[model samples]
Target: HISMINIPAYGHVNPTLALVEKLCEKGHRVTYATTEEFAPAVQQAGGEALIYHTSLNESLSILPQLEELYKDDQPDLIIYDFVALAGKLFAEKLNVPVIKLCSSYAQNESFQLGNEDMLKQLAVPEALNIVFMPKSFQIQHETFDDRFCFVGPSLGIDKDDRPLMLISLGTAFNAWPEFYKMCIKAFRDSSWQVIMSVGKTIDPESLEDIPANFTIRQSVPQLEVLEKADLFISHGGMNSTMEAMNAGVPLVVIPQMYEQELTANRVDELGLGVYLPKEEVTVSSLQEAVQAVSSDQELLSRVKNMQKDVKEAGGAERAAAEIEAFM
Candidate 1:
């Protein structure tokens, strides 16, 4: 029996669903524990859903409840999200094997320096970690030991029909109606077709003047959109970055936070795309960045190169194999 526990956050939860489905297909009895909101996704992925009331914002709050809930039927192995400490603790209590799923960059000794406080809060576990990004995309890639499996992004994750452009700030930080307005002005009537996910922070109608060339929604099937997109304007979240890379689409990243800034810099450093600082994202600048990225032959090829790495990194199939072997 296998039990997978994850936080409610989409980045953490989404990455593991494919693996869950894969494990179930292999005939493993997989039980997925999460909050009520994400239970349907777990059920759809073929895992037995175990929903709890704990906020999961802080794992410590859920420890006792998790322990009591699983006391009668302890799983043989546990697969958990990187930030879900209660799962790790329960594994310790049960003395079962563990697999830690990292949705973002895998931390090394160097990566651990300034992140001690954050890491301390989300206590690290002594188990194999399956990172969602390739080794090349990780900072100080060489430093991660064999215990870490850099399986890249899932293959089944996003496209466009024209010389298409897709823009999103991701689910969490996409409140910038002003930025969306800027994007509207930037690509108003150009040759490109734009699909923008504005999230719930702002009303699409509030942006005004929905151009004929643009499609704006509160959310989008991002992986499907990337399948045909020639260019992507993104917030540099790891999930979004990996999706764009896997689709071999060039990016114009405008990072929202420090971590996303690192992702943006790496995208620029590797020549897969251009990093357009959010502060510098005026109408003209946004248009120029899009034009520059879309036209760069070398950058396009580099994106293809990284796309190969993403494929070779062995997505959900590889991750499931690792889990089965470990068992």
Candidate 2:
């Protein structure tokens, strides 16, 4: 049995879901440790959820529940979120072999907490770590660790109706009600089908005007949408960025935070897409960015090449193949 531990955040939860499902599909009995809110995704991934109450903090307190976990049954191997230090602590206590599932770019020495000093308490040293980024976006370092493997994005599939466009701010930090309404005005009469994920906090009804071409929902299967999407309008979350890149869809990023700002900048730096500030994203500007962006042959070619690299990077299947050894 494998115990997969995670926090409540979507960014952390999403990257590993497909891997958990793949483990189950391979006939492994996997129990996922998480909160009630995100349990559905776990179950959908073919894992039994070990639900607990958790706070909003990135590293939410899980001590009481952690103790309860070891009282009777224990996992054969522990697969934990990199941010959820509790799982590493649990594995250490039991002397169990474990793997850290990375939700974003694999940290090199240059990244925060990539060294001994900064990650002293936060990370438990492991022989193996599974990163969700391709090599193209990762920072170059003088040396690389063989224990780390770049498995790219965990991608899923869906069929297409029309050439698609996905607009999202991601599950966390997605309170962009104004942006959704503005999108309706921007692409109200376009030939393309526009799908916008407004997130759970805001009611789609609150965004007044609607256009026939626009489909607004609290959420959709994003990877499925991206599969058919030709272009993506994003808030520059790492998951959104990676998924778009995996789907061969270029981005028109409007970043809302510093990390997201960096993601936007990186997209521009790679010549993969264009970046616009959140304050500067008007309808005309938004349209120009997407239209101008889609026409960039160089951008499309790079994204196409990256998509091939991502495919061969061996996402959930590769992670599962490597992780099954721990069991």
Candidate 3:
């Protein structure tokens, strides 16, 4: 299990972790390569850790750093998060099958292109290329060529209930203290018991005034919780939204960053959720979005219907099976 090189960002690590744990539980020898920050979590999830660091400040130069880090140990298969370009490059170099574990919906051009000018200002040519690529050229459009695979959402949760709602903002960019406060405030007044997965970055002190109707925790069994949720207030991450749809829950996406914004747009296009920018995020907006979608029994019904197709897609297990086959 060649995981992403960076682990501090939960978004990059969590999706891969979901599959890694399952594979480990199945008695496979798993080697999770990532940053030191994520090693503890990976170990806790029953995977051996191969730790490395990258040039965080210098994004373009990371390929060489990753090549050096992964030079010694060669794995049969590599599973990398989308942000970990090094993982993809390394996998190609080692002649191993590579699986892209997307943590957010920003895998497509819409998300990348929406912020093209901003990325250009930063002198990021690679980002500009992604932003400029046609939607037809995206990874999702690729056939199962075996060299690269897009395991849409590796969320460990299985689907059982209807109208499920997941509240997740991933780990690193979930910096919206105010948004969490609003989520608690809005849902607190309702009959719904909002299950909130507050990423580790948030302090419990920040949620001191949370209402009783919401489940506030550093993290929860997301798949279990999503199985029973009715609607999701998500950061429009790839994994969270895909998991929500996999469970047949409509979304009210409060995208936190450029990548999330693109994911939100894709969700909207898919009729899976409503997208809202951070600047436009408000209790009223959430209320309207939730009410509009949740009220329509058909949207939930449609999403639930899609869940069957998604489930049949066989995400993590298939990925592992493919890797083992490659080996």
Best by lDDT: 1
Superposed model 1: Cα runs more than 4 Å off: 56-60, 63-67, 113-125, 155-161
Q: Estimate each model's TM-score.
A: 0.93, 0.89, 0.74
Candidate 3 Cα misplacement greater than 4 A, ranges:
1-8, 21-29, 44-46, 54-57, 60-72, 76-79, 88-114, 117-150, 157-166, 198-209
Candidate 3 lDDT, tens digit per residue, 1-327?
444343346666766676677778777767876667778988887888877664352346455454465555667666655566666677667777665554543334323334546442211222111111112223355432333344445555444333345677866666667888877766767766677777777876667766756667777776677667788888866667667767777788888777677768777776666787888777887777878888877666767765765665566676556555654
Best-first order by TM-score: 1, 2, 3
On TM-score, the stronger of 1 and 3 is 1
Q: 279, model 3: CA deviation in Å?
A: 2.5
- Under the 3 Å rule for N, CA and C atoms, how many clashes does model 3 have? 10
Question: lDDT, candidate 2, residue 13?
Answer: 86
Clash-forming residue pairs, model 3: 104-238, 105-238, 111-262, 157-223, 163-230, 164-229, 164-230, 165-229, 165-230, 165-231
TM-score of 3: 0.74
Error of 1 at 120 (Å): 6.7
lDDT of each: 0.85, 0.80, 0.63
What's the lDDT for candidate 1? 0.85
lDDT of 1 at 54: 70
Query: What lDDT, from 0 to 1, does candidate 2 have?
Result: 0.80
